[PDB]
Amino acid sequence: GIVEQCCTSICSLYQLENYCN
Amino acid sequence: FVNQHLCGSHLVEALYLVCGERGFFFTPKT
């Protein structure tokens, strides 16, 4: 999920955006 | 070297920015 994708690893804008409501 | 990881309060601030008026759900690990 978001912590593994963006904290442990590095994520891109549309990966982040997909977590939005 | 500069750190690209987004963790903790920095991660929820990123969501606040990108999600804008759409909002979001989030669960702190803390």
From Swiss-Prot, chain B:
The lineage of its organism: Eukaryota, Metazoa, Chordata, Craniata, Vertebrata. This is Insulin B chain. The gene is INS. The chain holds residues 25 to 54 of 110 of the full protein. It comes from the Eukaryota.
